[PDB]
Design a protein around this ligand. Structure first.
Ligand SMILES: Nc1ncnc2c1ncn2[C@@H]1O[C@H](COP(=O)(O)OP(=O)(O)OP(=O)(O)O)[C@@H](O)[C@H]1O
Ligand SMILES: Nc1ncnc2c1ncn2[C@@H]1O[C@H](COP(=O)(O)OP(=O)(O)OP(=O)(O)O)[C@@H](O)[C@H]1O
Ligand SMILES: Nc1ncnc2c1ncn2[C@@H]1O[C@H](COP(=O)(O)OP(=O)(O)O)[C@@H](O)[C@H]1O
Ligand SMILES: [Mg+2]
Ligand SMILES: [Mg+2]
Ligand SMILES: [Mg+2]
Lengths: 470, 51, 578, 315, 193, 193
């Protein structure tokens, strides 16, 4: 209701307003110009002399004679409800699908509180993503943080959409049927363009995956403070759904490099000295406040799982953004440019990929008895095959021993069948079947990492069952 | 002969070049930080000429 | 008391006014919610306060109250079997009142103010008490907790409370000048606790891991570092040290590691067992737990709280082992704090005073004569995680300059499932020579020579890898093939240790001495047979290979017969040879 | 002599504090800072003007405040009371005994920064010192009045080589002439940033060889204040110069871990926002190092000498 | 303003084998060609202006040589339009702001070019827009920010440079016009690191 | 001042084979000898002082050790000059400013030495001038500019360092003096990178 009209300075994104000591730090304001158009802003400095407001959007029509500022909310909040499944929002909570706005049950601050370290429990259940190179060798456990590392031209958006469309939980394996629990996907896309926006909307709506999803979409021409606020609302909704309705939610943050760049620009706008390589000194803490909101909590049935996606700047893992992500998260999944250029999709390279909670989520009564040893054997056999392939170009294929040719043929068949799956939605049984059929090319007794009981139970199948099924 | 030549010559030279380049870049970063500190100091000192 | 009002808010920085009289580096309470912070700069009537938690919602004009004291910890009964964060707040009692989330501005106490204790005095009126002496004792688990007069208090006793049940807040001893002494006292974490005199390292710090206490030993009151990669044993070895070492109290500090990894230690540790009595392991340990999303000030101050609690328990007369996890994370917190103060970086962006802080942490360890006239020691083992796996990192370089031992783990031996994964070529220890009189006065007279012989056998094999990696082992001469086989036997039967096994996890000095004696007897008799002229396959045929392999799994009661039986058996078996 | 105190503190920020009405403080003077608890710290005036004076504190500024703190002048020039009776004593790098014995009686007070030697007043170093090490005595020989540091590493044994040099050093007058009559050979040992293990080793070596009667030890520990590391070699060289050029002693000075001195210099320089040098080290480091090493040598018309053997480990 | 943004499904034919076969760009797409001096950005963009299948070409010489503008002014009237058969200069609009012209008029030149390209899109044409260097725009921004005495970003550029670049490149695309027709704008930008 | 500057056409004989055969220097030229520590700068300049054919030698020890000046002061009265006979010190002027001496006097010593060398040139002699290190002069300039709170250019050096260096070296050359005679000044400066 009250409006302050003591504007004394306008330059770039900042404006100063005098006699405004009633505005709390971090508040949200409305800025009305002479023509009546209303913009938005955020208070970044409060003093006895004046308050400093960082303005969303541009400051074209503003002038000192007629501009006014009024308060909206002391602390930024978001109204949440279970009606939000199936809706789309713009990154500050405004719907963009043309439907009426939701009526909230509660309004929660977007900067959530940390979890008590004694309240957590160990993650011990897996998620079937439908991709063989992830389910078998780099398994995703409920409560993990597993980033995907990609590059400039690699198809990270396609893999993100495929995982969001195909992901599910498998309660029949865990408890012989157990009881069916709800599943939801929270999708946050930050700094995307129009082509990717159309692609995401079409992919989510063409197959009915929208009925269990919430989308927070932020375009590249949107204000940068919306980009800062975008993942926090997604995590607020995810935590609300998981710890107040016992949902199993999966959160996908589509590009963290855009978040880091927006953080750098916002920090430089507030006149702060940067840290290493021009990025802010508080970057580790700011990224930790986002990643560490996942996990599973003792006494609750729900869980939150995160899959951040980031693009390495020049295929450099010593860049600060991929370097600090390795200190907080549990492993990574790496895309390969060679596999992508050879025509293989999804181009996941198994050698540098790793999951650090795999052993707690597989095994007896969780996936199957033979999971771990099969994954180890596949890793070792592929590692041998690639070096043999490099040696063949010098010494020739006739100078090889008998088993080396078998390893080379295994490497070719592995890349052709296990990794390159296209748009198939393979269950874990199908992935293990293909993996066991691939290991049967190698002679029995060369499989050192697998015990003889599993070999007797599962060895000997032929790969023609998928050779004739592309 | 080729293996020993690589291990004893080629790798140490590349490693030394990497070390030198990293030190040069770090020095430039430090100088730019000092300049930014001076600029912020001047901005602060200008805002109190007449109160 | 100094009180003021907020003048300006800008991020975490708050400028208060009307605070004439506030001291530097005091702890304040900002706003109505009572968020805490330090004073970092005084300017006329103002003061610069840096709040630990988020400042959103604060308004200009809210009160600021200074407590007048720097960062301090409460030291007294009730710290064992407790889990704390970086600034000594109990997490269990926070969970009981606020739920699964840590809300800002919660008020708890480090020690429980409602539990009764049994007080047995050891002084009487008319006595003169100086700092560090004993006023009484209190039973806590299997220990007797000595109540100590604070180090800066002296006077004459006026009245002593009789035996009974009292809380920690009741004044048990009142002096003639009016001073009231309670069961606890506060001490600043950044100031070291005084002693009488520092002694010399002459007794070993047993670890239970054979390679660590034989090849690269560390003394009681020494310092060690362990730069391991992922999956290398950097966590299994630390819990093995917690279980099987000869320290009475263990302090474990997590300097800001991941939450999903902090849950592992917070869950597994309550289920362990104390090898001395069979009770819970947590009855003798103190845990400081931090995650990455907690405030950076607590993460930076985490290790000082642990070292101060270790110094307090040393002052009581015990032996304390302090393990710090990932001092690299602490260095990251230090770098962030320095960046917020706008300081000029050095090397890799770290502040120029990193080495000074690291030395000021590591040099608080040692064996001392306490102010009460007893003996105590503090041993620090600090893990290091280099960023790119390179050992030229500033943190590792500053750590290498002040430690007396260095256990360099490597993942190459973890790939091949060799545990522990210690790279014996790169590791070193500077306590090897000075502990030898203890070894020869306690274990056996020939122990240093036998250890040097085993080390020389391991060194001899290292020079033959340039020929094994050119031609296969089957083309080597029998004299060199003997040392290759004995090197494999040493590397796979003596350096290897199962910490999950019933008897292999713990190993005394005499058992290792016997195993080394058997291995050296095998090698010497095989070489003597070679001089006579034999094929290598008849030496490998001998049944004493399994009796020299199965010496790990024998119990300590059956060792003194098994060792002599094996020695006589191998002597007879090499008598029955050409 | 009377004392004067200044109570007008207007600003404390990190290691610096500002005193306004102190127009009678000389540049470079040493002050004593007292707070409410009665603890007394030390400081040095680094910039003085009409509006205020700038003082940097020798240790941390915890507990200081603008209402109770006072600043008192001690002396306009940093000085050290030196005597011939300090042979056999031990000090803490700031000039206070740590052996439990009573403080010495000063014959004179000398400025610790010293004055430059006149190049006309020097003379050529010529007397050959035989250390008994073949790689030194034959190819890299050491002469009285020379400065010859040892370039060490992280794990290399520099301390043992220094001890072996300090145990086996003789001048061998029979070969070169001038005739017998061996002169006293004092040893001044300055350790900076040293750890307890190295300190114990050095003390045990000196007490076993029996060289402690002719030795002065200045010991600075790793947990001492940073500023005390800067002043540690200056008092050692002041004592060495006094003994050598006023009592005809032949002094051998050993400076341990100059890398610690350079790191402390970088800390102090970065605290006062200077433009950094090659790797963050201050751009005036050459002058500061030259003011230490250039205090050795021999003087025409005098029988004494100063020989320096610094020790540093290349990173 | 437009009515609806459409998906790209028709290639932008450039006449160059490697850029048309291996690395295609669509009709409403965007592209960037960075390289050091003497590597061939100007020749590539002029070949695009000569041989592409766009109806109208708008060429923006932000902070470049004047001899290249003279070359375009001289050579183009005698060439033949690929699809309409007339002179090539009858389908081209030139905006020239050379290196020695005043500095502050480079950003204005970029905006004027993109506004004219959006005007020709609303009439149902397909427009190609060439910006000869977007690095000179950033240099001009840095020069003005030096006088404004602002706090600089990574390399002295103002902190809002990325927002301006994103706002410029987001004006391309295939749309449905307010009059119900269909047009497109495709932007090719050159970078001089 | 001078009347005219001439072209150098006679050698400056240093007495060293490699510097007189492979890389000669003329009688009015300038030379620079850079190198790391312990590589042979001081020995080369002192050999030039002892054995060269110059009439008068001016040695400027700006910011160096005090023992080297003592060695020159002691050894030189006993030697003899190659030109005339008599002691070598009778043709030498020494300017000494050691490393522990005040830093601001490093700048003045170079100018004093070059002015003295120019004065002896005006009488018709041939003068050789040696600067023991010109890096210490740059360090002194850096320290003074740091006190002045100026903005540095590279490695903390003030932006006008190259102008001072060029003005110092430009005083060398073979001239026709105002009195009608002919003189020369040759400068050899050592650099300590
Ligand atoms: N496709 C090509 N076919 C033939 N010659 C070419 C081609 N591309 C470049 N060149 C030659 O290389 C030169 C490169 O000059 P050009 O003007 O293309 O450089 P530029 O990268 O735009 O440089 P600037 O940074 O100076 O603007 C041309 O003048 C021409 O001689
Ligand atoms: N021409 C030479 N003939 C013989 N020995 C030489 C010669 N030049 C140098 N040396 C030897 O090498 C050493 C190098 O010392 P010198 O004083 O020449 O070094 P510098 O380049 O002036 O070093 P600084 O950077 O310390 O001033 C001499 O002391 C001498 O032992
Ligand atoms: N001495 C050992 N005995 C048995 N297993 C070990 C030993 N050392 C390491 N391991 C194995 O290595 C794995 C990794 O644990 P560890 O390396 O201690 O923690 P982190 O991987 O977090 O560094 C453990 O699962 C453990 O089974
Ligand atoms: Mg671990
Ligand atoms: Mg061009
Ligand atoms: Mg020299």
């Amino acid at each position: 209701k009250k409006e302050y009209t003591g504007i004394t300075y306008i330059s770039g994104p900042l404006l100063f307003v005098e006699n405004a000591k009633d505005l709390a730090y971090g508040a949200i304001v409305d800025i009305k110009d002479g023509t009546g158009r209303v913009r938005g802003g955020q208070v970044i400095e409060v003093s006895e002399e004046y308050a400093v407001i960082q303005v969303f959007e541009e400051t074209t029509g503003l002038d000192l004679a007629t501009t006014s500022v009024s308060l909206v909310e002391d602390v930024a909040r978001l109204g949440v409800s279970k009606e939000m499944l199936g809706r789309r929002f713009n990154g500050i909570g405004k719907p963009i699908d043309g439907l009426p706005p939701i009526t909230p049950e509660k309004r929660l601050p977007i900067t959530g509180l940390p979890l008590n370290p004694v309240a957590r429990r160990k993650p011990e259940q897996f998620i079937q993503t439908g991709i063989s190179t992830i389910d078998v060798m780099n398994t995703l456990v409920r409560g993990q943080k597993l980033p995907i590392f990609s590059g400039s031209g690699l198809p990270a958006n396609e893999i993100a959409a495929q995982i969001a469309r195909q992901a599910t939980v498998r309660p029949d394996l865990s408890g012989e049927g157990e009881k069916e629990e709800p599943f939801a996907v929270v999708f946050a896309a930050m700094g995307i363009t129009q082509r990717e926006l159309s692609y995401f909307i079409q992919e989510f709506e063409r197959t009915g995956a929208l009925s269990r999803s919430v989308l927070f979409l932020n375009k590249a021409d949107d204000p940068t403070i919306e980009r800062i606020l975008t993942p926090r609302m997604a995590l607020t909704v995810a935590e609300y759904l998981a710890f107040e309705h016992d949902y199993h939610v999966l959160v996908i943050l589509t590009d963290m490099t855009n978040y880091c760049e927006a953080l750098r620009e916002i920090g430089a706008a507030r006149e702060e000295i940067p840290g290493r390589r021009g990025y802010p000194g508080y970057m580790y803490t700011d990224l930790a406040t986002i990643y560490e909101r996942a996990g599973v909590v003792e006494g609750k049935k729900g869980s939150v799982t995160q899959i951040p996606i980031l693009s390495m700047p020049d295929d450099d893992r010593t860049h600060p953004i991929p370097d600090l992500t390795g200190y907080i998260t549990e492993g990574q999944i790496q895309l390969s440019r060679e596999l992508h250029r050879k025509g293989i999709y999804p181009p996941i390279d198994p050698l540098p990929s790793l999951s650090r909670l795999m052993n707690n989520g597989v095994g007896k009564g969780k996936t199957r008895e033979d999971h771990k040893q099969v994954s180890d054997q596949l890793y070792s056999a592929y590692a041998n095959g690639v070096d043999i392939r490099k040696l063949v170009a010098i010494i020739g294929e006739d100078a090889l021993t008998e088993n080396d040719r078998r390893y080379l043929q295994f490497a070719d068949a592995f890349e052709r069948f296990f990794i390159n799956q296209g748009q198939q939605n393979r269950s874990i049984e199908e992935s293990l079947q293909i993996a066991w059929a691939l290991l049967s090319m190698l002679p029995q007794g060369e499989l050192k990492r697998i015990s003889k009981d599993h070999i007797g139970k599962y060895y000997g199948q032929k790969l023609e069952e998928i050779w004739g099924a592309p | 002969r080729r293996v020993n030549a690589l291990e004893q010559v080629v790798i140490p030279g590349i490693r030394a070049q990497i070390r030198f380049i990293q030190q040069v870049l770090e020095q430039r970063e430090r100088e730019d930080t000092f300049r930014l500190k001076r600029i912020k100091g001047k901005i602060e000192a200008r805002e109190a000429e007449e109160e | 008391m100094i009180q003021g009002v907020i003048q300006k808010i800008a991020g975490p920085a708050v400028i208060a006014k009307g605070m004439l009289g506030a001291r530097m580096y005091d702890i304040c309470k900002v706003g109505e919610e009572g968020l805490v912070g330090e004073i970092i700069r005084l300017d006329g009537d103002t003061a610069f306060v840096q709040v630990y938690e988020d400042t959103s919602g604060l308004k200009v004009g809210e009160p600021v109250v200074s407590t007048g004291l720097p960062l301090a910890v409460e030291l007294g009964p009730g710290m064992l079997n407790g889990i704390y964060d970086g600034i000594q707040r109990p997490l269990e009692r926070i969970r009981e009142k606020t739920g699964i989330y840590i809300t800002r501005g919660v008020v708890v106490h480090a020690l429980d103010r409602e539990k009764k204790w049994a007080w047995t005095p050891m002084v009487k009126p008319g006595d003169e008490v100086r700092g560090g002496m004993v006023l009484g004792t209190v039973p806590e688990f299997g220990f007797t907790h000595k109540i100590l007069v604070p180090p800066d208090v002296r006077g004459r006793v006026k009245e002593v409370k009789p035996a009974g049940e009292y809380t920690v807040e009741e004044p048990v001893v009142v002096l003639e000048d009016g001073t009231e002494l309670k069961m606890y006292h506060t001490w600043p974490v950044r100031r070291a606790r005084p002693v009488q005199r520092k002694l010399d390292p002459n007794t070993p710090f047993l670890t239970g891991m054979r390679i660590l206490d034989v090849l690269f030993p560390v003394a009681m009151g020494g310092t060690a570092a362990i730069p391991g990669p992922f999956g290398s044993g950097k966590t299994v070895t630390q819990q093995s040290l917690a279980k099987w070492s000869n320290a009475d109290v263990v302090v474990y500090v997590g300097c800001g590691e991941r939450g999903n990894e902090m849950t592992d230690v917070l869950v597994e540790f309550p289920e362990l067992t104390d090898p001395k009595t069979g009770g819970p392991l947590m009855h003798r340990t103190v845990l400081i737990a931090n995650t990455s999303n907690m405030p950076v000030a607590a993460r930076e101050a985490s290790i000082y709280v642990g070292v101060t609690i270790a110094e307090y328990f040393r002052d009581q007369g015990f032996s304390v082992a302090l393990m710090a996890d990932s001092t690299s994370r602490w260095a990251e917190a230090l770098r962030e704090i320095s960046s917020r103060l706008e300081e000029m970086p050095a090397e890799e962006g770290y502040p120029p005073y990193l080495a000074a802080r690291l030395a000021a942490f590591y040099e608080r360890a040692g064996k001392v004569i306490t102010l009460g006239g007893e003996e105590g020691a503090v041993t620090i083992v600090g893990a290091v995680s280099p960023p790119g796996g390179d050992m030229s990192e500033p943190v590792t370089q500053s750590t290498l300059r002040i430690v007396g031992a260095f256990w360099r783990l490597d993942a190459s031996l973890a790939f091949r499932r060799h545990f522990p994964a210690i790279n014996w070529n790169g590791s070193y220890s500077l306590f090897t020579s000075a502990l030898d009189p203890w070894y020869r006065e306690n274990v056996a007279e020939d122990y240093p020579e036998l250890r040097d012989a085993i080390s020389e056998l391991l060194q001899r094999e290292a020079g033959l890898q340039e020929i094994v990696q050119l031609v296969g082992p089957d083309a080597l001469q029998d004299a060199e093939r003997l040392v290759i086989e004995v090197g494999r036997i040493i590397r796979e039967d003596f350096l290897q240790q199962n910490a999950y096994h019933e008897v292999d996890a713990y190993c005394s000095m005499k058992k290792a001495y016997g195993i080394m004696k058997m291995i050296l007897a095998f090698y010497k008799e095989a070489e003597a047979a070679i001089k006579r002229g034999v094929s290598i396959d008849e030496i490998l045929q001998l049944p004493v290979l399994e009796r020299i392999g199965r010496a790990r799994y024998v119990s300590e009661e059956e060792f003194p017969a098994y060792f002599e039986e094996a020695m006589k058996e191998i002597q007879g078996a090499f008598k029955a040879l050409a | 002599l009377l004392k004067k105190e200044y109570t007008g503190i207007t600003y404390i920020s990190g290691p610096l504090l500002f005193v306004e009405n102190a127009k009678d403080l000389a540049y470079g003077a040493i002050v004593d800072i007292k707070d409410g608890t009665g603890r007394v710290r030390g400081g040095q005036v680094i910039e003085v003007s009409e509006e205020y004076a700038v003082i940097q504190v020798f240790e941390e500024t915890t507990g200081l405040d603008l209402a109770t703190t006072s600043v008192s002048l001690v002396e306009d020039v940093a000085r050290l009371g030196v005597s011939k009776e300090m042979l056999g004593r031990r000090f803490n790098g700031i000039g206070k005994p740590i052996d439990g014995l009573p403080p010495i009686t000063p014959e004179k007070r000398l400025p610790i920064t010293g004055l430059p030697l006149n190049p006309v007043a020097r003379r050529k170093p010529e007397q050959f010192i035989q250390t008994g090490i073949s790689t030194i005595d034959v190819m890299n020989t050491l002469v009285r009045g020379q400065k010859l540091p040892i370039f060490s590493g992280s794990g290399l044994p520099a301390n043992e080589i220094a001890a072996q040099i300090a145990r086996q050093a003789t001048v061998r007058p029979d070969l070169s002439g001038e005739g017998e009559k061996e002169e006293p050979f004092a040893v001044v040992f300055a350790a900076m940033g040293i750890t307890q293990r190295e300190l114990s080793y050095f003390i045990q070596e000196f007490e076993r060889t029996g060289a402690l009667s002719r030795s002065v030890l200045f010991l600075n520990k790793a947990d001492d204040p940073t500023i005390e590391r800067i002043l540690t070699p200056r008092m050692a060289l002041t004592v060495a110069e006094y003994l050598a050029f006023e009592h005809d002693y032949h002094v051998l000075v050993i400076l341990t871990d100059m890398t610690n001195y350079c790191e402390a210099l970088r800390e102090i320089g970065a605290a006062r926002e200077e433009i950094p040098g090659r790797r963050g080290y201050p751009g005036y480091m050459y002058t500061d190092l030259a003011t230490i090493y250039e205090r050795a040598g021999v003087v025409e018309g005098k029988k004494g000498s100063v020989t320096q053997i610094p020790i540093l480990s290349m990173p």
